[PDB]
Design a protein around this ligand. Sequence first.
Ligand SMILES: [Mg+2]
Ligand SMILES: [Zn+2]
Lengths: 315, 63, 148, 116, 189, 48, 179, 59, 61, 63, 149, 185, 376
Amino acid sequence: DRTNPLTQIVHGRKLSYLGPGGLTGRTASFRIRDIHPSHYGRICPIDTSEGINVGLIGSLAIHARIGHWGSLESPFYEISERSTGVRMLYLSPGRDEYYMVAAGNSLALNQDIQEEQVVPARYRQEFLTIAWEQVHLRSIFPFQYFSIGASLIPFIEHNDANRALMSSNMQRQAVPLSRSEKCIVGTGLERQAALDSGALAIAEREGRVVYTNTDKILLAGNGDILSIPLVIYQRSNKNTCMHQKLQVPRGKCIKKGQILADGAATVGGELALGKNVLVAYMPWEGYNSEDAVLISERLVYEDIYTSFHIRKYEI
Amino acid sequence: QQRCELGRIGRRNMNRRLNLDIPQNNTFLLPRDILAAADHLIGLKFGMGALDDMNHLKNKRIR
Amino acid sequence: AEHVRAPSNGKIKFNEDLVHPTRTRHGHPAFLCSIDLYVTIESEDILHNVNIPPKSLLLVQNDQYVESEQVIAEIRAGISTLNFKEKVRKHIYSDSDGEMHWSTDVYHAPEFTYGNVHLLPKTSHLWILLGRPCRSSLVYLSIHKDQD
Amino acid sequence: GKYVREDYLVKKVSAKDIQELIKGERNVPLIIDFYATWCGPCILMAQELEMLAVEYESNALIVKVDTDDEYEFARDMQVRGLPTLYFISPDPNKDAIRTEGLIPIQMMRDIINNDL
Amino acid sequence: VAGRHGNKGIISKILPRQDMPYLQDGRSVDMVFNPLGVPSRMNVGQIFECSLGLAGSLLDRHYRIAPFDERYEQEASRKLVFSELYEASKQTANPWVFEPEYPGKSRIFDGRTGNPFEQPVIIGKPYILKLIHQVDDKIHGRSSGHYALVTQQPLRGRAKQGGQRVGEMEVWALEGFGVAHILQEMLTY
Amino acid sequence: PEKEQWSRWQRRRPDVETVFLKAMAETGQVKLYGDHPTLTETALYRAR
Amino acid sequence: PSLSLHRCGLPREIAIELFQTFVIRGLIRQHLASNIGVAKSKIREKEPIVWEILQEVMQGHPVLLNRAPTLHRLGIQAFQPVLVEGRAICLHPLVCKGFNADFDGDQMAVHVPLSLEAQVEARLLMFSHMNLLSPAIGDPISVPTQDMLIGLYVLTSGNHRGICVNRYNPCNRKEPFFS
Amino acid sequence: GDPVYPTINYIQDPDEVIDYRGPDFHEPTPNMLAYLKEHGKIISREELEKILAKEKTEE
Amino acid sequence: IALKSIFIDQSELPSRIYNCLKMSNIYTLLDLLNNSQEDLMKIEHFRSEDVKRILGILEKY
Amino acid sequence: LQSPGIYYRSELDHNGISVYTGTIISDWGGRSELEIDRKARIWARVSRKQKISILVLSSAMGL
Amino acid sequence: TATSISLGIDDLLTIPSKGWLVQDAEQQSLILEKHHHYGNVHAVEKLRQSIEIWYATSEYLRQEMNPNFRMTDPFNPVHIMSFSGARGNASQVHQLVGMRGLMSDPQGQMIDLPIQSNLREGLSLTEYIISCYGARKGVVDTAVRTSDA
Amino acid sequence: RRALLGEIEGTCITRVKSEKVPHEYSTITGIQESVHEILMNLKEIILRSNLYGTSDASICVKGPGSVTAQDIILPPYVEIVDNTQHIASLTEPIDFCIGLQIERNRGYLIKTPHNFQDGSYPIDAVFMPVRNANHSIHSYGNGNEKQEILFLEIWTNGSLTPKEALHEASRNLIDLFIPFLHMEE
Amino acid sequence: FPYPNPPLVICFGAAQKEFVPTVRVSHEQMHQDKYSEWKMLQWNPPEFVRAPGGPPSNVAISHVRLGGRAAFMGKVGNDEFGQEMVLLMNKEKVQTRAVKFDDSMRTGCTHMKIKFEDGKMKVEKVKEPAEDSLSSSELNLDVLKEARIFHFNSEVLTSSSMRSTLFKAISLSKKFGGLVFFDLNLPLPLWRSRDETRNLIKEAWEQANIIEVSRQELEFLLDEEHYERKRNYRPQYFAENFEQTKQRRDYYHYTPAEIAPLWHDGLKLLFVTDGTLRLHYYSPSFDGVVVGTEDVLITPFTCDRTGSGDAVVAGIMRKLTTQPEMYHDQDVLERQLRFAIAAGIISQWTIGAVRGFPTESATQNLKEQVYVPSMW
DNA sequence: TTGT
DNA sequence: ACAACTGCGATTAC
RNA sequence: GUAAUCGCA
Ligand SMILES: [Mg+2]
Ligand SMILES: [Zn+2]
């Protein structure tokens, strides 16, 4: 799915129960489709497929990895005192059960030693409150329990969990516009999202940009010249235009990994699937009944939400 | 052959639940494994056991 | 199960001879009430009287000071047979390694012919003497012995 | 390294390597950087040194020395703190310039162009 | 159109800028949304976003915030939003951006009449996306063009220029209303 | 408890009502019982 | 929001395809088109008289709207199509409850009764003004729901009566009189 | 009052090009073909041509 | 306009008038320049001769 | 996909004690079940018939 | 349109006694945990006490929500939307201005960790993960309900 | 406010004719911007004119450099305001020749004739000179006679000064309100 | 006539952007080239670099940000770097009337000569302006008169042209009634041997009223191997206290007898910081320890401790200039040191010492949030 | 699968 | 052996 | 014309 750069990355993270040798939609029991405490940090608890296959198609956590034994593994910090005194271990699902994993902070003092403070923790697939002396592990990573779709929602704590799935599904539908603008408020994951989307020109060699053109970019390094071909008004699988624009000017040095050009729905190296417009929350003469929006003509005559769509016909 | 065609993963899991010292390499349904299975089964009747959750990730593999 | 709350901050005054001592389901001590009683919340300017005759739990004591909107008593009048009553079981998991100990009120014979299950005739405590359990082979037992 | 280019262009040399480089003859300016994995400021200094090495492909030599591996050598070089840069000139009569703390990349460029 | 917080809507009217409500600055709002969705679908982060966005636009800043900022303290998001709005109000002297009486809310006027509204409204600049589903793709209409070889019913699909289907749940409604001739015409000719 | 425990609710939540009550307590517009507005006074101000 | 219970907004690009035969007959009757082919070519050319004839055609014709989740009997109703300049079918707000419709992406179908008996049935039985009570318990199904209810509540809420309207007791001491 | 967590962490320049060589980004993604060639997993056409020519000359 | 970057600390001033300008929320030359002689005189502990001293030091530049 | 191994589920009968069963899962997908009735009754559910003798299976294995 | 009702952050008014109630509840919970470590009470008593006290606190908060709005801020936009009948319910507004209470984990077993924060203050990571259980149950319930209906 | 926004008219470029481009979604050698980017840049060219009708302009630049609004040759009636707006950038010695049609209208114009004479591309134009407007009414404190003070803030785009915009809005309002004082038809 | 109400202080030393003087040998090492894995060491930092301190300018910046007035005394060249640092200090409302400009030298660069002979033995041909301040004509006397606290680090002791200037400034400050704050912040050469560092810093130690030293520095000056063997002691058969049974991290409180060799008559307060986790205070009358905490893990990605110690010193100086009963009363001393602890805790969450410096409101908020109402 |  | 929401739209594969 | 897969409300 190449409707937008986000779809290309979120498509490859799907884990499916239904398939050859797996539970069919009808076959799947209710139990199969609910979160199990084991899914913490390894699977997304708010990304599913809406329909008859609800709870059967899910995404994969941001920090997860697949293990030697075929098991998804998650990164847990070890607060236990040792020689190194710090570790990041990808504990497997069965191993983390026999550990006191506390996700809370330590900013509490009650005239006693700090290790005597209490904190919610997880043990044997349960929740309980224990002292800081007895907690073996700690989950520090903020994006550990979510996926790319949910993590792009700012202030997700103040939103209901039910609407999170709707927002994740609707972020997938965005159309790349003729012009792109970054978001004033963001979660900070748009950078790596645009980096790993694949619609960005990243240099594979250090050097200087000797020649700049719309069709190609010439990068001269270590006595060798490399040519990078750009994309000019191509067509995706979902009838959405793909285009790239140069970001670096002529005569600047670029390392192996930096951004040479900006693809569609990406500006300054960050994912940009929309625009920033002034909004007021009030009823206006019924035009807002149910859900409906009243918009001004400025969005029309200034090309704020203009988009290009390309459809192919072949005989 | 298909019932005894336990994978390497299968061997490991069998060893975990039923304490066995069978080497990882011998990925076959040995009769000791069956014997042990029977032992645990009878032990479950007297309370010395724990049933297994089939929705646990540790009980699932990713292809 | 309505919960009676203190109308204002003040002392509680009632006659403890009418109420019978009991133990609440939360492990707390309380006074069982079976007859219409009058309790007085003695505040700076006013006195309040609130209580309900039927079987209720009094979670306070005479002369005790209580703050406003605290749970003084639990009416617990709602009581009936539950057709959906389920004998749910919960397990207690040890939080430290060691050995088991019981002094009294525990049967010395297993409930079944085979197994470690033991039954308790009366209430008692189970003591886990802290320690580190190791695995000892036949070879190690020859050199590793008691009090080494 | 023919098919895939190396990500980092600054090499970690030892103390004997630095002694041999200073003792020998050089045709390009030399830049010595003392770092430690632990110091926070050094994380930035390394990025600026990478940018400088990219800007100066073969007109200057940039090397880095880990203070944890060579502590006595760093102490003998009169190195007070970690974000320290040693600028060695090519001609061996001129005096070396030692800079301490985070300095702008333009300052490094001007030093290499004029002082060295 | 949609927002990142689960807010979705369909455009219903394109009013000119002169009819749009304007702030005390003098600028007409680009979109107007229904304020009754917040208690219904329980989306409170949208308010925060709008406000922070107004603040940023004025101060020329972009905010990349990791989720669950309330691990530091209580009402961390509220403190951040109100602090940034105050600063914007002080630096660009637009007193309206932060109202001490009702933080985050301002009093706007009507573009048509020019009279102020009674209660203050939320003014912000959220991130709105345009979704793939579009009206042009969904428009369809058939008169009498093509039929299936065996069934001889009209064809299916918008690209194939086919009509709409009258299912069993609609025949039931037609029979409950009592329109026998309409059902007969639809089922035969 | 003999020693005072720690809680996230130990502090008083800031509000517009408390700030306005502090602002109008000066200049003699209103009078409050003490130097810091209490929750009952904040509710009364929210009302009036 | 400015339509009546009997009127519904209908786009022109849909109406021209639905009522195409009627506008062909109109072009043939008036001295605007000689044959069916010339009339079809003129309709394809989007001539201005074609829209006038289309408006004159459907002034008394009923349109049958319906929804995909037709659970109750109010899923299919009848309205008077009004020509609009757009691609979105306008609907009266008070009639939304019946269709369980929200403007979040929902779509609807349109049906044109050809026979005179079908037209009479649609105009008499299936109209909205004749169906204002749900067939479950006979309760009003078309009532102010979200914004009109808020407006009515603001209108009839009242006024600050006690301590809110006055700071001191009026004992120590409404005004306007309208005929 | 002022937030405990510094706001300067959230603040970001609007017209800023994100440097993917920072401390918060992972290592650059290696091209699959070049990565397989450098480790010897996939040989070049020249090596296969030379091997086939040697096998033909031997026969 | 480089007057913004020219703080009063760089210009050599007596300690008394320096503290007076610091208390009067004057940190840059531009600010002083915006301020008028009468206004400057208003600041506490600021003598008329001081207005002369700051004017002379400014005219020196 | 579910990992191969031994699973030990239980199921309560309509009248009497709860039935305990152990299933062994293979890579191909074999199901060598084992069940226990109110008595010892260590019966495999491999055969479609009422039951099967675990002792007979062990003797065939080589015991 | 003339009045232009709107909802803001400061417009979500909590009852003026949430802090005291939550503080005494967590104090009693800590005392009971300490005495459970001593051996005065067993596990089932602690479970019952925690569940009952947090459910009672949530119910009292929801009960006192409406009188607070009626007496203190009668013209509150959230209160207007709830009382008029346009959109919202007492349970839904309790999630916004009160507390989410004790969510139930799958298989009908209580989580035992209370959600002491509403959507205005902001839930924690654990509380959000717990509410994910309710969201999944809701969506699967919606699907099965549509099919069965 | 309603007069300044929507009742004031201006002049903008409405049609652009390119020499040897296949379509408006392609790139021409020697220019950093595509045809669409050049059209978008020409769309934001502010002009000043006081007469109605269509006029013709052209752009004839050559050699490597940057073509701006100064290269545009205009009829004597039309003039340029900014004179330094960026039309396009040439990175090679090329001859850049383009034709422009200048029209004066009001409001916004939809580019309806997409299918038209080949080689000419129509660009939608917004003829609104006033960007934003605002007003505030402060009291005068005159006791019984409740007099007030009016303030007006006008933001134009250079085509006309704010005072000229105010006078034109006043004259347009008077022209709109005059017909009611004529004899009945 | 009277000085401004906030008491002014003086920070004396070298102005450096992000200098880290405290360098030792770390046992744990990360990847040499990948600087994206070096944040794992900020998380569990080496003992000596748990709460590092930097240039004196950072102390003045933090002091001004935490509320108060401060001035920097030093010399910087007329180059772009010196003017950049001066502008940075002025934008944050730090006084520079005691900062001198010399066109003859350039700030930050020290000319040296390799002179390889059996070893790489360098020598200083010229010195930087940051390390070259003349005692005679480069000391402003008015700032010394107004100053109540005089702050400087041992970095000035390394040079041979700034020791006399520091001694003259100390004498002039004591002449008008000011106090001397001495933060060791030992540089790399000062960690060779305890005897040489003790003999070199004895002169500045004698004339210092307030001295703040790290735990590692205090142990290094007091037979570090003894305390290293002490912390590793484990009871063989049975413990004698509850702390030994639970095996928590060691937080040793040094008895005044152990600190007696380092105690002089003119010493009022001695602070032994344990890296924003414990804080020890010593006075002629009373001795104690203030409990603290560290939560760098809460924000894993930034995690920079570069400016913690400077913020702690700034908060200590602020509370000493504001609260005059800290010397006499112990509980007030602890309640005020909690402020500096909270300041350090806030300062560890942001990369950049000058960038992530706490304000007074944020520090008070964190102090109230972390500590119970009785303690604050 | 789930139950009929 | 039998059945388990209603329809719509898009793609690729035969 | 049938499948597979996703989406829609
Ligand atoms: Mg809908
Ligand atoms: Zn938040």
